[PDB]
Amino acid sequence: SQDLENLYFQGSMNIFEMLRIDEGLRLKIYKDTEGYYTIGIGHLLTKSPSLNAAKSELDKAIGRNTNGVITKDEAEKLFNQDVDAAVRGILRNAKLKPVYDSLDAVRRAALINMVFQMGETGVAGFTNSLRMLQQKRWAEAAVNLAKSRWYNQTPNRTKRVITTFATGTWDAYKNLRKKLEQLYNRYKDPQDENKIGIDGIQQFCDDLALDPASISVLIIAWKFRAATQCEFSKQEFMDGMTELGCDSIEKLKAQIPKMEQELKEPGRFKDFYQFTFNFAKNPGQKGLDLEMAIAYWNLVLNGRFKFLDLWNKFLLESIPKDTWNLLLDFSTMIADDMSNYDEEGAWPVLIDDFVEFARPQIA
Numbered sequence: 249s250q251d252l253e254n255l256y257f258q259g260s261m262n263i264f265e266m267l268r269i270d271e272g273l274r275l276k277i278y279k280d281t282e283g284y285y286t287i288g289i290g291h292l293l294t295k296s297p298s299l300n301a302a303k304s305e306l307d308k309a310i311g312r313n314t315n316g317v318i319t320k321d322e323a324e325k326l327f328n329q330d331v332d333a334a335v336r337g338i339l340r341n342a343k344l345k346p347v348y349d350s351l352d353a354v355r356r357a358a359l360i361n362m363v364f365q366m367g368e369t370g371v372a373g374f375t376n377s378l379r380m381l382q383q384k385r386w387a388e389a390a391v392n393l394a395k396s397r398w399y400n401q402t403p404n405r406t407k408r409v410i411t412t413f414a415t416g417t418w419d420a421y422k423n424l425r426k427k428l429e430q431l432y433n434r435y436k437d438p439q440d441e442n443k444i445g446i447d448g449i450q451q452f453c454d455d456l457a458l459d460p461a462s463i464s465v466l467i468i469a470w471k472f473r474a475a476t477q478c479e480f481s482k483q484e485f486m487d488g489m490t491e492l493g494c495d496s497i498e499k500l501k502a503q504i505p506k507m508e509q510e511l512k513e514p515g516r517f518k519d520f521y522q523f524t525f526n527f528a529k530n531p532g533q534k535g536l537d538l539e540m541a542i543a544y545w546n547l548v549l550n551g552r553f554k555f556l557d558l559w560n561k562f563l564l565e566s567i568p569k570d571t572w573n574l575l576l577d578f579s580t581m582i583a584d585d586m587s588n589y590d591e592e593g594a595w596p597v598l599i600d601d602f603v604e605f606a607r608p609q610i611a
C-alpha cells in the first residue's frame with residue numbers, strides 16, 4: 249500500500265528527490281531547530297523530550313523496530329504521507345487549488361516544494377505569479393517570482409524551483425547532480441567508485457588550500473557528518489555538499505569560516521568535540537588510541553583548555569568515550585589554580601590523577 253513499487257510507473261525524479269536536495273534528508277533521529285525529535289525530510293516524530301518516545305513513534309510509522317535509524321526508502325514512505333497531507337491542504341485552499349489543478353506533474357512538484365518551504369499562506373501571497381502560472385505564462389511567472397523576498401532568503405533553492413516552473417523539466421536538479429558528480433569524480437578512489445581514497449582526500453584539502461592536519465579539515469568532516477577519518481564515502485560527499493548548499497570548491501571554501509563561527513556557541517562546540525572521538529576512533533577498536541587522542545585534543549582544545557600543555561606532559565609520562573567527553577566538562581569548569589576541583593565528582597580516574605599530577609606546577 250505504501251510500497252514504493254506502487255510508484256514504479258512514475259518518473260525516477262520526483263518530489264521526494266527534489267526535497268532531498270532542497271531541504272535535506274536525515275536517516276537518523278535528530279533534534280530540529282527547536283528541541284524536537286525529527287527524521288527523514290523534516291518529519292516530526294514527537295515533542296516529547298524522551299528519545300525512547302520518539303523511537304516508539306518511529307517504529308509505529310515504519311512497522312519495525314528501527315532503533316532510530318531508517319533507510320532512504322523508509323524516509324520516502326514517511327515523506328509521501330506528508331506530501332499527501334500537504335496536497336489535500338492545497339486542494340482545500342481557494343487561492344491554490346485552481347493553479348495546482350492547472351499544472352502538470354513537474355510543476356505541481358515545484359508548487360508543493362514552495363508549500364513545504366513557506367506554507368500555504370506564504371505561497372498564496374504570490375497572487376500575480378500564481379495567476380501567471382495558471383495562465384501558463386512561464387517566463388513572466390519566473391521573472392515575478394525572482395523579485396521576491398523568497399529569492400533573497402534561499403537563492404539556490406529558489407532558483408531551482410523557479411527553473412522548474414519556467415521549463416516544466418527537472419533540468420535544474422539534473423544539472424546540479426551532474427555538477428556534483430563531476431566534482432566528486434576528481435576525488436574518487438580509482439579502485440572504488442564510491443569512496444574518496446587517500447589521494448582524493450589529499451587533493452580535496454589541496455583544492456581547499458588546507459593542511460590535512462588543520463582543525464578546518466576536521467570541521468568540514470563534522471559538517472559532512474563523516475563516519476570515520478580513513479574513509480570518505482560518495483554518499484557523505486554528495487549529502488554534505490548538498491546540505492551546505494555548495495556546488496563547487498569555491499563555494500565550500502567560502503563556507504568554512506561560517507562553520508568555524510558556528511563553534512562559538514558552546515552547544516555546537518560540544519557537538520563537534522564529541523563528534524571528533526567517533527570520527528577519530530578506528531572502527532572496531534573499543535577505545536581511542538592514546539596518541540590519536542592526544543593529536544586531536546591538541547587540535548580541538550588549543551585555546552580552550554588552560555592546562556593543555558600539562559595534559560600533554562601527563563599523558564606522555566586507550567581513551568574511552570566517557571573519558572573523552574568529560575575532559576571538555578573539566579576544561580570548562582576548572583579554575584586556573586584547580587581550587588574548585590571536586591574529587592568526589594566521579595570524574596574519570598585519569599582526570600583525578602591529572603589534578604594530583606598538576607599541582608606541583610600550579611604551586
Ligand SMILES: *CCC(=O)Nc1ccccc1CN(C(=O)Nc1cccc(C(F)(F)F)c1)C1CCN([C@H](C)CCC)CC1
Nearest residue numbers: 446449450460461465468469474477478479480543544547
Ligand atoms: C586515516 C588515513 C588517512 O590519514 N587519510 C587521509 C589522507 C589525506 C588527508 C586526510 C586523511 C584522514 N583525515 C581526515 O580528516 N579524513 C576525512 C575523512 C572524511 C571526510 C573528510 C573531510 F571532509 F575532507 F574533512 C576528511 C585526517 C585525519 C587525522 N590526521 C591527523 C593525524 C589530524 C591531526 C589531529 C589528519 C588527516
